[PDB]
Design an enzyme around this catalytic site. Structure first.
Site, PDB file in Angstrom:
ATOM      1  CB  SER A  35     -31.627  -9.775   7.550  1.00 31.23           C
ATOM      2  OG  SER A  35     -31.835  -9.324   6.240  1.00 31.23           O
ATOM      3  CE  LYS A  59     -31.269 -11.747   4.343  1.00 29.77           C
ATOM      4  NZ  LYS A  59     -31.422 -10.551   3.477  1.00 29.77           N
ATOM      5  CG  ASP A  90     -31.139 -11.938   0.215  1.00 27.78           C
ATOM      6  OD1 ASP A  90     -31.418 -12.625  -0.785  1.00 27.78           O
ATOM      7  OD2 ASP A  90     -31.997 -11.559   1.048  1.00 27.78           O
ATOM      8  CE  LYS A  92     -34.903 -12.754  -2.071  1.00 26.46           C
ATOM      9  NZ  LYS A  92     -34.080 -12.198  -0.978  1.00 26.46           N
ATOM     10  CG  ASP A  95     -30.742 -12.389 -16.308  1.00 26.24           C
ATOM     11  OD1 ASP A  95     -31.055 -12.959 -17.384  1.00 26.24           O
ATOM     12  OD2 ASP A  95     -30.749 -11.140 -16.176  1.00 26.24           O
ATOM     13  CB  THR A  99     -27.176 -12.533 -17.505  1.00 26.45           C
ATOM     14  OG1 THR A  99     -27.378 -12.233 -18.882  1.00 26.45           O
ATOM     15  CG2 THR A  99     -27.355 -11.301 -16.659  1.00 26.45           C
ATOM     16  CB  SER A 150     -41.408 -15.060   4.166  1.00 30.76           C
ATOM     17  OG  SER A 150     -40.915 -13.819   3.738  1.00 30.76           O
ATOM     18  CD  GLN A 209     -47.823 -14.129   4.614  1.00 32.57           C
ATOM     19  OE1 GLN A 209     -47.260 -14.836   3.771  1.00 32.57           O
ATOM     20  NE2 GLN A 209     -49.060 -14.341   5.026  1.00 32.57           N
ATOM     21  CE1 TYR A 210     -40.715 -10.336   9.600  1.00 32.60           C
ATOM     22  CE2 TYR A 210     -42.512  -8.889  10.069  1.00 32.60           C
ATOM     23  CZ  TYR A 210     -41.260  -9.086   9.549  1.00 32.60           C
ATOM     24  OH  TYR A 210     -40.568  -8.034   8.993  1.00 32.60           O
ATOM     25  N   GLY A 228     -34.211  -9.551  10.202  1.00 34.10           N
ATOM     26  CA  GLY A 228     -33.867  -8.171   9.912  1.00 34.10           C
ATOM     27  C   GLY A 228     -34.452  -7.251  10.959  1.00 34.10           C
ATOM     28  NE  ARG A 229     -38.681  -5.138   7.939  1.00 35.17           N
ATOM     29  CZ  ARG A 229     -39.664  -5.223   7.055  1.00 35.17           C
ATOM     30  NH1 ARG A 229     -40.496  -4.219   6.850  1.00 35.17           N
ATOM     31  NH2 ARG A 229     -39.789  -6.327   6.320  1.00 35.17           N
TER      32      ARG A 229
HETATM   33  O1  LIG Z   1     -34.609 -15.202  -0.136  1.00 32.16           O
HETATM   34  C1  LIG Z   1     -35.538 -14.700   0.575  1.00 32.16           C
HETATM   35  N1  LIG Z   1     -36.743 -15.348   0.654  1.00 32.16           N
HETATM   36  C2  LIG Z   1     -37.802 -14.937   1.384  1.00 32.16           C
HETATM   37  O2  LIG Z   1     -38.844 -15.519   1.465  1.00 32.16           O
HETATM   38  C3  LIG Z   1     -37.638 -13.751   2.090  1.00 32.16           C
HETATM   39  N2  LIG Z   1     -38.392 -13.086   2.890  1.00 32.16           N
HETATM   40  C4  LIG Z   1     -37.653 -12.039   3.329  1.00 32.16           C
HETATM   41  N3  LIG Z   1     -36.426 -12.075   2.716  1.00 32.16           N
HETATM   42  C5  LIG Z   1     -35.323 -11.186   2.986  1.00 32.16           C
HETATM   43  O3  LIG Z   1     -34.997 -11.397   4.381  1.00 32.16           O
HETATM   44  C6  LIG Z   1     -35.024 -10.153   5.066  1.00 32.16           C
HETATM   45  C7  LIG Z   1     -36.270 -10.103   5.954  1.00 32.16           C
HETATM   46  O4  LIG Z   1     -36.144  -8.947   6.739  1.00 32.16           O
HETATM   47  P1  LIG Z   1     -37.157  -8.637   7.938  1.00 32.16           P
HETATM   48  O5  LIG Z   1     -36.862  -9.620   9.030  1.00 32.16           O
HETATM   49  O6  LIG Z   1     -36.803  -7.217   8.272  1.00 32.16           O
HETATM   50  O7  LIG Z   1     -38.565  -8.758   7.388  1.00 32.16           O
HETATM   51  C8  LIG Z   1     -34.972  -9.060   3.999  1.00 32.16           C
HETATM   52  O8  LIG Z   1     -33.615  -8.682   3.701  1.00 32.16           O
HETATM   53  C9  LIG Z   1     -35.638  -9.717   2.813  1.00 32.16           C
HETATM   54  O9  LIG Z   1     -35.110  -9.209   1.591  1.00 32.16           O
HETATM   55  C10 LIG Z   1     -36.307 -13.111   1.972  1.00 32.16           C
HETATM   56  N4  LIG Z   1     -35.301 -13.551   1.274  1.00 32.16           N
HETATM   57  O1  LIG Z   2     -36.232 -11.022 -18.335  1.00 32.88           O
HETATM   58  C1  LIG Z   2     -35.650 -11.863 -19.094  1.00 32.88           C
HETATM   59  N1  LIG Z   2     -36.300 -13.025 -19.423  1.00 32.88           N
HETATM   60  C2  LIG Z   2     -35.808 -13.990 -20.229  1.00 32.88           C
HETATM   61  O2  LIG Z   2     -36.389 -14.992 -20.529  1.00 32.88           O
HETATM   62  C3  LIG Z   2     -34.534 -13.772 -20.742  1.00 32.88           C
HETATM   63  N2  LIG Z   2     -33.777 -14.434 -21.541  1.00 32.88           N
HETATM   64  C4  LIG Z   2     -32.669 -13.678 -21.731  1.00 32.88           C
HETATM   65  N3  LIG Z   2     -32.771 -12.544 -20.966  1.00 32.88           N
HETATM   66  C5  LIG Z   2     -31.837 -11.445 -20.961  1.00 32.88           C
HETATM   67  O3  LIG Z   2     -31.850 -10.929 -22.313  1.00 32.88           O
HETATM   68  C6  LIG Z   2     -30.525 -10.904 -22.823  1.00 32.88           C
HETATM   69  C7  LIG Z   2     -30.371 -12.022 -23.858  1.00 32.88           C
HETATM   70  O4  LIG Z   2     -29.117 -11.830 -24.457  1.00 32.88           O
HETATM   71  P1  LIG Z   2     -28.661 -12.683 -25.731  1.00 32.88           P
HETATM   72  O5  LIG Z   2     -29.480 -12.213 -26.894  1.00 32.88           O
HETATM   73  O6  LIG Z   2     -27.203 -12.336 -25.820  1.00 32.88           O
HETATM   74  O7  LIG Z   2     -28.877 -14.148 -25.401  1.00 32.88           O
HETATM   75  C8  LIG Z   2     -29.587 -11.032 -21.622  1.00 32.88           C
HETATM   76  O8  LIG Z   2     -29.234  -9.740 -21.093  1.00 32.88           O
HETATM   77  C9  LIG Z   2     -30.410 -11.829 -20.638  1.00 32.88           C
HETATM   78  O9  LIG Z   2     -30.067 -11.486 -19.298  1.00 32.88           O
HETATM   79  C10 LIG Z   2     -33.897 -12.491 -20.357  1.00 32.88           C
HETATM   80  N4  LIG Z   2     -34.414 -11.574 -19.593  1.00 32.88           N
END
Ligand SMILES: O=c1[nH]c(=O)c2[nH+]cn([C@@H]3O[C@H](COP(=O)(O)O)[C@@H](O)[C@H]3O)c2[nH]1
Ligand SMILES: O=c1[nH]c(=O)c2[nH+]cn([C@@H]3O[C@H](COP(=O)(O)O)[C@@H](O)[C@H]3O)c2[nH]1
Ligand code: PRO
Ligand code: PRO
Lengths: 257, 257
Positions: A35, A59, A90, A92, A95, A99, A150, A209-210, A228-229
């Protein structure tokens, strides 16, 4: 009837990206994903070069790189090809489908152009996957679904985790596995990647948490550790990566028996 | 004992960003948030200028802007100040606390520098909020928690929604409300913003589902409608925005009685 990574790479239903990953894991004896949580392109690239032989995957969080350019990602690809690892952004995605397809293909990051793998939260329902796969399938990419987290207070439990597994198994032309703390699917075609990993016990002050490599690969049945860290903050990141690689690899071997 | 937006702006526990928003909603007779889902800075800015008088908020997806620069966001701020609307970056932070604080402050987007509001998914647990608030509290920003989603198959239901409400009410120095399909909190200090809104029935082909302004403001008790394509895809976006504004405003007035 647990199969090695190399045999899983040949499974009939394997996704090509998963197959490529599993083959290089077996070849290099690594199930470590670095990471690379750094803000400077030079540090990212120097880590990728030095640690590339030790990792199956790097990642990224492209949105924390202060000096991101697409050229940086070209240089990262060169290193990924040289050292044989996959690039996992990563991001995530989380939406609605309409989008996320733009967030994946477009903007300044053009994630789909350089990331072998991305991940998505399942909370929006399967439209998140359908939107991503419209971009990712033509580009021969794969996706990981976040089935568990995690961090303290995670809501990705119970029926939520089950929904993630079902969503993956219904989108297997694009979804190649999970981010999870343990094995969540019994289907060996799916990869399990586990973050929240360090050799020593503890956490951070913001809910991380680790668990150890032995615990998550060996007892909990995951495939790959995301670290990562535990690496990044060490003085010698190469030796740290080697310690994590050896830990995760042995834990895999000993479970395989 | 439903209060007007202007009276809610004065509530003892109101967050300053919520107060500013509620005051301008009352002054301008608008509870419309434009979802400015465009890829070109010029279109973003031309929409913000022309529609600014009609909106209380402009919601961005900075990561789909092909020609993002921080200067574009400076120009957007000028328009937000001129026309009196808040800028909401719909980033859907959804990582562990340590990661989201960097994604919020740093990278190429520097979101916290220009966004009055951001949002977060609650799936990681409250560390997501704690990480954001470390950056956002010193910068006098606010956050919205995603308590429900509009898309087919959403998992943000039941106990998940309840967890989002609890998380907001325990982080009220930073969390100012919700993205939801209905009123989810009985506390009038919290804003409810509802996407998935069009005047006509239907959806999209990637899981979006629509309800009308009258339904979501009037029956479901939400405060603000978030509208993208219902405006953006229309030929005359100003008239479309006015139709949505009038719909949402009347629905609010008629519920207030
Ligand atoms: O999809 C994810 N689900 C998880 O549960 C989760 N936990 C940690 N992270 C990501 O992984 C990295 C962890 O970094 P560390 O080893 O430094 O804590 C960082 O880059 C975090 O953003 C997650 N990503
Ligand atoms: O936080 C959110 N929770 C939701 O349930 C949700 N539904 C739509 N979107 C976002 O709102 C906009 C909808 O665009 P439209 O009117 O074109 O469908 C777009 O920009 C979408 O990304 C959400 N954002
Ligand atoms: O020869 C190899 O490397 C693969 C591993 C499983 C069977 N064939
Ligand atoms: O005068 C105003 O505009 C506010 C509204 C509630 C009471 N004072």
């Amino acid at each position: 009837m647990e199969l090695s990574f190399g045999a899983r790479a040949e499974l009939p239903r394997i996704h090509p990206v998963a197959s490529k990953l599993l083959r290089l894991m077996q070849k290099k004896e690594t199930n470590l994903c670095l990471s690379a949580d750094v803000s400077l392109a030079r540090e990212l690239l120097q880590l990728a070069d030095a640690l590339g032989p030790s990792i199956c995957m790097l990642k990224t969080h492209v949105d924390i790189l202060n000096d991101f350019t697409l050229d940086v990602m070209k240089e990262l690809i060169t290193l990924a090809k040289c050292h044989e690892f996959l690039i996992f952004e990563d991001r995530k995605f989380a939406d609605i489908g309409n989008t996320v397809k733009k967030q994946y293909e477009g903007g300044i990051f053009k994630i789909a152009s350089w990331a072998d793998l991305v991940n998505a939260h399942v909370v929006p329902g399967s439209g998140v996957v359908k939107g991503l796969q419209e971009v990712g399938l033509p580009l021969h990419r794969g996706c990981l679904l976040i089935a568990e987290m995690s961090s303290t207070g995670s809501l990705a439990t119970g029926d939520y985790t089950r929904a993630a597994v079902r969503m993956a198994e219904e989108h297997s032309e694009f979804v190649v596995g999970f981010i999870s703390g343990s094995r969540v699917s019994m289907k060996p075609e799916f990869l399990h990647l586990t973050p929240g990993v360090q050799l020593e016990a503890g956490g951070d002050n913001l809910g991380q948490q680790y668990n150890s490599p032995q615990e998550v690969i060996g007892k909990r049945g995951s495939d790959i550790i995301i670290v990562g860290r535990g690496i990044i903050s060490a003085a010698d990141r190469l030796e740290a990566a080697e310690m994590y690689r050896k830990a995760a690899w042995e834990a895999y071997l000993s479970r395989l028996g």
